């Protein structure tokens, strides 16, 4: 009804980095410390109005665990935006972003937009990846990066808004 | 008691409330339809009947839409059930799983994924409605 067009987005990243909680706060304004790992894949809707335009966000939430990596790969192709999520409190998550990008190249069609977020920045205390590291990596790929916190509602909005527009600009400009 | 499936049920009920309003005015619109059909200043009333055709159209768009929203929530519920059932099955160790347990665990995983599939099919068909509305309403 309300939506001019809808975009399919995808959240990928090692298990536990908070993809589900990120999607939860974006769509619901809420958070739950309880850890319940995504089984297979899920998706949620949020319609937004940027540029005077309402766009229906169909956001797919992949399971981080290798068990389902198989299945999650199936949904890379239709994706029109993808967000690679790593955990500031875990560096190994940060290093697997390369593995995720390889996955993107094997399954997502090259035109895909891309964005990287380091989440759980609400507490620096156990930070093991400096924010500077993350940004220079993103710039190495050229794609936009941001730190976020689903616990504190920091940049979740911001992030989804900007990837949503970049796909807009790219597709209407075409 | 339940927890924030609540939202799903209140919303389902609201959807059927406005559904109810809608086929209410579908009945009314249809009856004025056959009244003015019986009629055929006449120019003015033709303008009015034109308004009513527009109205039937708008009502159909809203109605088919509401029907989808309804089945969306039904699927979301079914998904919730299926998911928590699979997890309870997954807590037992693989060593303790026999063929019945393994296979039905299996079975609920696939039913689950298929339910997700149909959710998306509703998103897509909802979209074909959006684009057709754009396309024929382009003349308007
Ligand atoms: N402090 C903090 N904790 C967070 C944040 N986001 C998620 N968490 C916590 O970190 C854990 C990860 O949750 P989850 O969203 O399921 O991560 P995930 O990447 O979806 N896991 P999986 O990929 O297996 O489904 C949870 O215990 C959650 O409460 C955040 O922004 N800040
Ligand atoms: Mg998850």
Author numbering:
A (entry chain A): 3 to 176
B (entry chain B): 533 to 572, 582 to 681
Give the exact sentences the study uses for this entry:
Rab proteins, the biggest subfamily within the superfamily of small GTPases, are major regulators of vesicular trafficking in eukaryotic cells. One such family of effector proteins that was reported to link Rab proteins and the cytoskeleton is the Mical (molecules interacting with CasL) family. In this publication, we present a thorough biochemical and structural analysis of a Rab effector domain termed bivalent Mical/EHBP Rab binding (bMERB) domain. The results show that the domains probably constitute a Rab8-effector family involved in endosomal trafficking, and the Rab-binding specificity can be well explained from the 3-dimensional structures of complexes determined in this work.
Well diffracting crystals were found using the RBD of Mical-cL (residues 534–683) in complex with different Rab proteins (Rab1, Rab8 and Rab10). In all structures (Rab1:Mical-cL, Rab8:Mical-cL and Rab10:Mical-cL) we found one Rab protein bound to one molecule of Mical-cL, in agreement with the previous observations that all Rab proteins tested bind only one site in Mical-cL. Most interactions were visible between the Rab proteins and α-helix 3 of Mical-cL with some additional contributing residues from α-helix 2, forming extensive contacts involving residues within switch I and II of the Rab proteins. Whereas we observed KD values of 2.2–5.2 µM for Rab1 binding to the bMERB domains of Mical proteins and no detectable binding of Rab1 to the bMERB domains of EHBPs, we detected strong binding and ca. 100 nanomolar affinities for Rab8 and the different bMERB domains. Besides the specificity of bMERB domains towards the Rab8 family, another interesting observation was made in the ITC experiments comparing the stoichiometry of binding of Rab8 and the different RBDs: Whereas Rab8 bound in a 1:1 stoichiometry to Mical-cL and EHBP1, a 2:1 stoichiometry binding was observed for Mical-1, Mical-3 and EHBP1L1. In contrast to the main interacting helix α3, which adopts a similar position in all three structures, we observed slightly different orientations of the α-helices 1 and 2, adopting a position slightly further away from Rab1 compared to Rab8 and Rab10. Interestingly, whereas Rab1 contains a glutamate near the N-terminus (Glu4), all Rab8 family members contain one or (in the case of Rab10) two lysine residues in this region that point towards a negatively charged patch in Mical-cL. The sequence of the N-terminal residues of each Rab protein is shown below the corresponding structure: Whereas Rab1 contains a negatively charged glutamate at position 4, Rab8 and Rab10 contain one or two lysine residues at position 3 or at position 3 and 4, respectively. (c) Consistently, ITC measurements show that the affinity of binding increases approximately five-fold after mutating the N-terminal residues (Rab1:Mical-cL: KD = 5.2 µM; Rab1R8N:Mical-cL: KD = 1.1 µM; Rab8:Mical-cL: KD = 0.23 µM).
